[PDB]
Amino acid sequence: HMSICTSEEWQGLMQFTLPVRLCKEIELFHFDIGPFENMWPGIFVYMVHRSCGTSCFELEKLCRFIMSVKKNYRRVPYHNWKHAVTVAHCMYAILQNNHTLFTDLERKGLLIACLCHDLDHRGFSNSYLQKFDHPLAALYSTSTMEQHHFSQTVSILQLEGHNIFSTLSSSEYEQVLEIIRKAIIATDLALYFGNRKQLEEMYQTGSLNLNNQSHRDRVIGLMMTACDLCSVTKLWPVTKLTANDIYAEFWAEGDEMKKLGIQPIPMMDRDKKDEVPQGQLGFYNAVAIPCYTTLTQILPPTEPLLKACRDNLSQWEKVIRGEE
Ligand SMILES: Cn1cc(-c2ccc(=O)n(C)c2)c(COc2ccc(-c3ccc4ccccc4n3)cc2)n1
Ligand SMILES: [Mg+2]
Ligand SMILES: [Zn+2]
């Protein structure tokens, strides 16, 4: 049932040399991949090599993997390849900026997870599939997409000469699949709330054991979430336009409800175009900010996110107050 790259593709990738003027930008957290799509797969390669060295993965096997992923990403408005790479740029950006803090076995699993975390998004929400009534919410009951996202990671690696992690002990290979599993689950934004709760507390008290493997996992979780929402931390006009990407998908899904004579929540309702900056603001305030705060908290390097998170918020304010 899976989908796979061709010789042409992965050898085309294998060939890629990133242009020197980009080595500078890509290191900034606010960096936006949008203009340079051609390079998108190439870029992820660059970042693996910068993080994990050109000797962490068999290059043939890697490019093969990157592109087959690329194929299991649907041509949807927002939950698409462009997204996976944007997110995975952010996890990188993070990991570089906290270099001593994560194992080799960690940077890998994550940078990978970040690429895979929405594999085969059909553009609808968990709520959409659960509350009626896909063969996906018939088999995965909770975090539907998020486990599919992973079982879709799972299968990909199980494809011919794709298994990038063949160079590890069944104990490390199993370890990293379990690093991924968790890390990809983390992206169920619902889960972030109980997750960030703890992380506020264990900071408040200050009983947060970086040695404790279950504590540990949680920081990742927020990390994921942080990267997942990162579109908010790009410069105003990048964020501006990405908002229409989420809105296309949202309303598209609300239109599907409407076609059964069901009122979709005003978020997915396109006939409420105007309430958006109002909504967006709430989200920044209730969700984004508390998120990037607790982060900058645990990982002070991550400050520029929160800095730029605010700058956008500020702008949405303006747009409401009548100044855009
Ligand atoms: C799980 N999740 C990740 C993201 C997200 C959000 C923004 C963003 O830039 N990214 C990258 C990701 C979201 C919803 O974000 C939104 C949050 C809220 C609205 C909203 C809410 C209420 C509205 C009411 C009326 C009109 C428009 C309204 N609009 C839109 C998007 N849910
Ligand atoms: Mg997701
Ligand atoms: Zn996502």
Side-chain angles (χ1 to χ4, degrees), residues 73 78-80 83-84 87 114 117-118 121 146 149 187-188 224-225 227-229:
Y73 265 69
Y78 172 107
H79 287 110
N80 60 17
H83 166 66
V87 171
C114 280
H117 83 277
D118 281 329
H121 208 291
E146 289 75 37
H149 293 324
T187 65
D188 181 326
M224 294 309 264
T225 291
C227 301
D228 208 358
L229 302 159

PDB file of all heavy atoms in Angstrom, residues 73 78-80 83-84 87 114 117-118 121 146 149 187-188 224-225 227-229, ligand 3:
ATOM      1  N   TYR A  73       3.513  12.223   1.628  1.00  0.00           N
ATOM      2  CA  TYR A  73       2.919  13.496   2.018  1.00  0.00           C
ATOM      3  C   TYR A  73       1.931  13.961   0.969  1.00  0.00           C
ATOM      4  O   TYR A  73       2.322  14.240  -0.160  1.00  0.00           O
ATOM      5  CB  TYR A  73       3.992  14.555   2.299  1.00  0.00           C
ATOM      6  CG  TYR A  73       4.325  14.612   3.762  1.00  0.00           C
ATOM      7  CD1 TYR A  73       4.983  13.559   4.370  1.00  0.00           C
ATOM      8  CD2 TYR A  73       3.930  15.678   4.560  1.00  0.00           C
ATOM      9  CE1 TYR A  73       5.279  13.580   5.722  1.00  0.00           C
ATOM     10  CE2 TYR A  73       4.221  15.709   5.917  1.00  0.00           C
ATOM     11  CZ  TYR A  73       4.898  14.647   6.492  1.00  0.00           C
ATOM     12  OH  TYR A  73       5.222  14.614   7.831  1.00  0.00           O
ATOM     13  N   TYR A  78      -2.013  22.593   3.963  1.00  0.00           N
ATOM     14  CA  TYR A  78      -1.079  22.897   5.045  1.00  0.00           C
ATOM     15  C   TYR A  78      -0.338  21.708   5.657  1.00  0.00           C
ATOM     16  O   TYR A  78       0.881  21.783   5.834  1.00  0.00           O
ATOM     17  CB  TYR A  78      -1.766  23.713   6.134  1.00  0.00           C
ATOM     18  CG  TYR A  78      -0.938  23.921   7.377  1.00  0.00           C
ATOM     19  CD1 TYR A  78      -0.371  25.157   7.656  1.00  0.00           C
ATOM     20  CD2 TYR A  78      -0.741  22.879   8.289  1.00  0.00           C
ATOM     21  CE1 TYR A  78       0.372  25.347   8.809  1.00  0.00           C
ATOM     22  CE2 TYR A  78       0.018  23.060   9.429  1.00  0.00           C
ATOM     23  CZ  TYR A  78       0.561  24.295   9.682  1.00  0.00           C
ATOM     24  OH  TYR A  78       1.291  24.463  10.819  1.00  0.00           O
ATOM     25  N   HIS A  79      -1.043  20.636   6.004  1.00  0.00           N
ATOM     26  CA  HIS A  79      -0.384  19.457   6.571  1.00  0.00           C
ATOM     27  C   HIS A  79       0.394  18.600   5.541  1.00  0.00           C
ATOM     28  O   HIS A  79       0.162  17.382   5.368  1.00  0.00           O
ATOM     29  CB  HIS A  79      -1.383  18.667   7.387  1.00  0.00           C
ATOM     30  CG  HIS A  79      -1.729  19.339   8.672  1.00  0.00           C
ATOM     31  ND1 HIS A  79      -2.967  19.892   8.915  1.00  0.00           N
ATOM     32  CD2 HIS A  79      -0.977  19.600   9.769  1.00  0.00           C
ATOM     33  CE1 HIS A  79      -2.971  20.435  10.119  1.00  0.00           C
ATOM     34  NE2 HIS A  79      -1.775  20.274  10.658  1.00  0.00           N
ATOM     35  N   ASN A  80       1.351  19.273   4.897  1.00  0.00           N
ATOM     36  CA  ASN A  80       1.997  18.829   3.680  1.00  0.00           C
ATOM     37  C   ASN A  80       3.483  18.752   3.917  1.00  0.00           C
ATOM     38  O   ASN A  80       3.954  19.048   5.006  1.00  0.00           O
ATOM     39  CB  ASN A  80       1.712  19.855   2.574  1.00  0.00           C
ATOM     40  CG  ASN A  80       2.229  21.261   2.920  1.00  0.00           C
ATOM     41  OD1 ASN A  80       3.057  21.420   3.811  1.00  0.00           O
ATOM     42  ND2 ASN A  80       1.741  22.282   2.216  1.00  0.00           N
ATOM     43  N   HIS A  83       5.320  21.595   5.327  1.00  0.00           N
ATOM     44  CA  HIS A  83       5.191  21.724   6.777  1.00  0.00           C
ATOM     45  C   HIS A  83       6.254  20.878   7.488  1.00  0.00           C
ATOM     46  O   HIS A  83       6.975  21.373   8.374  1.00  0.00           O
ATOM     47  CB  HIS A  83       3.752  21.428   7.263  1.00  0.00           C
ATOM     48  CG  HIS A  83       3.638  21.226   8.745  1.00  0.00           C
ATOM     49  ND1 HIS A  83       3.878  22.233   9.659  1.00  0.00           N
ATOM     50  CD2 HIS A  83       3.322  20.127   9.474  1.00  0.00           C
ATOM     51  CE1 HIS A  83       3.697  21.767  10.883  1.00  0.00           C
ATOM     52  NE2 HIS A  83       3.365  20.489  10.798  1.00  0.00           N
ATOM     53  N   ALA A  84       6.365  19.622   7.061  1.00  0.00           N
ATOM     54  CA  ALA A  84       7.267  18.681   7.687  1.00  0.00           C
ATOM     55  C   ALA A  84       8.679  19.246   7.658  1.00  0.00           C
ATOM     56  O   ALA A  84       9.420  19.163   8.631  1.00  0.00           O
ATOM     57  CB  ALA A  84       7.199  17.332   6.996  1.00  0.00           C
ATOM     58  N   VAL A  87       8.920  22.353  10.216  1.00  0.00           N
ATOM     59  CA  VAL A  87       9.012  21.780  11.554  1.00  0.00           C
ATOM     60  C   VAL A  87      10.397  21.194  11.836  1.00  0.00           C
ATOM     61  O   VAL A  87      11.043  21.557  12.831  1.00  0.00           O
ATOM     62  CB  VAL A  87       7.938  20.689  11.734  1.00  0.00           C
ATOM     63  CG1 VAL A  87       8.152  19.920  13.022  1.00  0.00           C
ATOM     64  CG2 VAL A  87       6.557  21.309  11.716  1.00  0.00           C
ATOM     65  N   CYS A 114      10.313  14.550  13.253  1.00  0.00           N
ATOM     66  CA  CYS A 114       9.832  15.841  12.745  1.00  0.00           C
ATOM     67  C   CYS A 114       9.455  15.840  11.261  1.00  0.00           C
ATOM     68  O   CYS A 114       8.531  16.540  10.847  1.00  0.00           O
ATOM     69  CB  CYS A 114      10.862  16.935  13.015  1.00  0.00           C
ATOM     70  SG  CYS A 114      10.831  17.580  14.705  1.00  0.00           S
ATOM     71  N   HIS A 117       6.155  13.337  11.112  1.00  0.00           N
ATOM     72  CA  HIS A 117       5.154  13.481  12.168  1.00  0.00           C
ATOM     73  C   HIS A 117       3.714  13.632  11.684  1.00  0.00           C
ATOM     74  O   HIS A 117       2.779  13.533  12.483  1.00  0.00           O
ATOM     75  CB  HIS A 117       5.534  14.624  13.102  1.00  0.00           C
ATOM     76  CG  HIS A 117       5.134  15.973  12.599  1.00  0.00           C
ATOM     77  ND1 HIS A 117       5.894  16.695  11.700  1.00  0.00           N
ATOM     78  CD2 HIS A 117       4.051  16.739  12.873  1.00  0.00           C
ATOM     79  CE1 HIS A 117       5.293  17.845  11.436  1.00  0.00           C
ATOM     80  NE2 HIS A 117       4.171  17.896  12.134  1.00  0.00           N
ATOM     81  N   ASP A 118       3.554  13.902  10.387  1.00  0.00           N
ATOM     82  CA  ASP A 118       2.238  14.123   9.756  1.00  0.00           C
ATOM     83  C   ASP A 118       2.113  13.352   8.448  1.00  0.00           C
ATOM     84  O   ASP A 118       1.192  13.588   7.666  1.00  0.00           O
ATOM     85  CB  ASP A 118       1.969  15.610   9.470  1.00  0.00           C
ATOM     86  CG  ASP A 118       1.540  16.393  10.699  1.00  0.00           C
ATOM     87  OD1 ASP A 118       0.891  15.831  11.616  1.00  0.00           O
ATOM     88  OD2 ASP A 118       1.864  17.601  10.732  1.00  0.00           O
ATOM     89  N   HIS A 121      -1.170  12.997   6.088  1.00  0.00           N
ATOM     90  CA  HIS A 121      -2.264  13.795   6.577  1.00  0.00           C
ATOM     91  C   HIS A 121      -3.266  13.946   5.430  1.00  0.00           C
ATOM     92  O   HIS A 121      -2.883  14.252   4.299  1.00  0.00           O
ATOM     93  CB  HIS A 121      -1.774  15.160   7.059  1.00  0.00           C
ATOM     94  CG  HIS A 121      -2.629  15.768   8.129  1.00  0.00           C
ATOM     95  ND1 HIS A 121      -3.911  16.216   7.894  1.00  0.00           N
ATOM     96  CD2 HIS A 121      -2.379  16.009   9.440  1.00  0.00           C
ATOM     97  CE1 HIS A 121      -4.420  16.694   9.016  1.00  0.00           C
ATOM     98  NE2 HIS A 121      -3.507  16.588   9.967  1.00  0.00           N
ATOM     99  N   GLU A 146      -1.898  10.715  14.818  1.00  0.00           N
ATOM    100  CA  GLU A 146      -0.555  10.684  15.388  1.00  0.00           C
ATOM    101  C   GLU A 146       0.085   9.275  15.410  1.00  0.00           C
ATOM    102  O   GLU A 146       1.307   9.148  15.283  1.00  0.00           O
ATOM    103  CB  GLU A 146      -0.559  11.331  16.788  1.00  0.00           C
ATOM    104  CG  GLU A 146      -0.748  12.853  16.800  1.00  0.00           C
ATOM    105  CD  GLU A 146      -2.181  13.322  16.522  1.00  0.00           C
ATOM    106  OE1 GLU A 146      -3.127  12.645  16.983  1.00  0.00           O
ATOM    107  OE2 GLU A 146      -2.362  14.373  15.847  1.00  0.00           O
ATOM    108  N   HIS A 149       0.450   8.427  11.752  1.00  0.00           N
ATOM    109  CA  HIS A 149       1.638   9.150  11.318  1.00  0.00           C
ATOM    110  C   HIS A 149       2.879   8.299  11.558  1.00  0.00           C
ATOM    111  O   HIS A 149       3.859   8.378  10.812  1.00  0.00           O
ATOM    112  CB  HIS A 149       1.788  10.494  12.047  1.00  0.00           C
ATOM    113  CG  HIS A 149       0.723  11.495  11.717  1.00  0.00           C
ATOM    114  ND1 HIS A 149       0.167  11.609  10.463  1.00  0.00           N
ATOM    115  CD2 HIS A 149       0.134  12.449  12.476  1.00  0.00           C
ATOM    116  CE1 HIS A 149      -0.734  12.575  10.466  1.00  0.00           C
ATOM    117  NE2 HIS A 149      -0.771  13.102  11.675  1.00  0.00           N
ATOM    118  N   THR A 187       2.921  15.429  19.254  1.00  0.00           N
ATOM    119  CA  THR A 187       2.322  16.445  18.370  1.00  0.00           C
ATOM    120  C   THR A 187       0.798  16.541  18.436  1.00  0.00           C
ATOM    121  O   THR A 187       0.234  17.441  17.816  1.00  0.00           O
ATOM    122  CB  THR A 187       2.768  16.325  16.886  1.00  0.00           C
ATOM    123  OG1 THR A 187       2.301  15.090  16.310  1.00  0.00           O
ATOM    124  CG2 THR A 187       4.279  16.423  16.770  1.00  0.00           C
ATOM    125  N   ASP A 188       0.138  15.636  19.165  1.00  0.00           N
ATOM    126  CA  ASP A 188      -1.295  15.749  19.370  1.00  0.00           C
ATOM    127  C   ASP A 188      -1.528  16.925  20.303  1.00  0.00           C
ATOM    128  O   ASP A 188      -1.586  16.738  21.515  1.00  0.00           O
ATOM    129  CB  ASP A 188      -1.868  14.459  19.965  1.00  0.00           C
ATOM    130  CG  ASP A 188      -3.405  14.517  20.175  1.00  0.00           C
ATOM    131  OD1 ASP A 188      -3.937  15.600  20.488  1.00  0.00           O
ATOM    132  OD2 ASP A 188      -4.094  13.473  20.044  1.00  0.00           O
ATOM    133  N   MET A 224       8.689  19.195  20.322  1.00  0.00           N
ATOM    134  CA  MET A 224       7.881  18.857  19.165  1.00  0.00           C
ATOM    135  C   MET A 224       6.829  19.931  18.914  1.00  0.00           C
ATOM    136  O   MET A 224       6.768  20.531  17.836  1.00  0.00           O
ATOM    137  CB  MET A 224       7.223  17.489  19.386  1.00  0.00           C
ATOM    138  CG  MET A 224       8.209  16.330  19.446  1.00  0.00           C
ATOM    139  SD  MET A 224       9.337  16.361  18.029  1.00  0.00           S
ATOM    140  CE  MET A 224       8.540  15.230  16.901  1.00  0.00           C
ATOM    141  N   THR A 225       6.028  20.172  19.945  1.00  0.00           N
ATOM    142  CA  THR A 225       4.950  21.128  19.911  1.00  0.00           C
ATOM    143  C   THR A 225       5.496  22.472  19.496  1.00  0.00           C
ATOM    144  O   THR A 225       4.965  23.113  18.590  1.00  0.00           O
ATOM    145  CB  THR A 225       4.302  21.249  21.293  1.00  0.00           C
ATOM    146  OG1 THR A 225       3.605  20.030  21.597  1.00  0.00           O
ATOM    147  CG2 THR A 225       3.320  22.406  21.322  1.00  0.00           C
ATOM    148  N   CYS A 227       8.135  23.171  17.749  1.00  0.00           N
ATOM    149  CA  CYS A 227       8.501  23.143  16.335  1.00  0.00           C
ATOM    150  C   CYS A 227       7.276  23.100  15.411  1.00  0.00           C
ATOM    151  O   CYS A 227       7.252  23.750  14.359  1.00  0.00           O
ATOM    152  CB  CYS A 227       9.390  21.925  16.066  1.00  0.00           C
ATOM    153  SG  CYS A 227      10.926  21.881  17.017  1.00  0.00           S
ATOM    154  N   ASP A 228       6.284  22.306  15.830  1.00  0.00           N
ATOM    155  CA  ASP A 228       5.024  22.111  15.132  1.00  0.00           C
ATOM    156  C   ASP A 228       4.283  23.430  14.890  1.00  0.00           C
ATOM    157  O   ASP A 228       3.737  23.672  13.793  1.00  0.00           O
ATOM    158  CB  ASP A 228       4.144  21.156  15.935  1.00  0.00           C
ATOM    159  CG  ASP A 228       3.181  20.377  15.060  1.00  0.00           C
ATOM    160  OD1 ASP A 228       3.162  20.610  13.834  1.00  0.00           O
ATOM    161  OD2 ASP A 228       2.441  19.520  15.591  1.00  0.00           O
ATOM    162  N   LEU A 229       4.287  24.284  15.909  1.00  0.00           N
ATOM    163  CA  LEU A 229       3.586  25.560  15.849  1.00  0.00           C
ATOM    164  C   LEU A 229       4.474  26.672  15.320  1.00  0.00           C
ATOM    165  O   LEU A 229       4.078  27.850  15.311  1.00  0.00           O
ATOM    166  CB  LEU A 229       3.061  25.937  17.230  1.00  0.00           C
ATOM    167  CG  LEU A 229       2.116  24.886  17.820  1.00  0.00           C
ATOM    168  CD1 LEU A 229       1.975  24.966  19.338  1.00  0.00           C
ATOM    169  CD2 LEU A 229       0.759  24.954  17.129  1.00  0.00           C
TER     170      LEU A 229
HETATM  171 ZN    ZN B   3       2.187  19.164  12.380  1.00  0.00          ZN
END
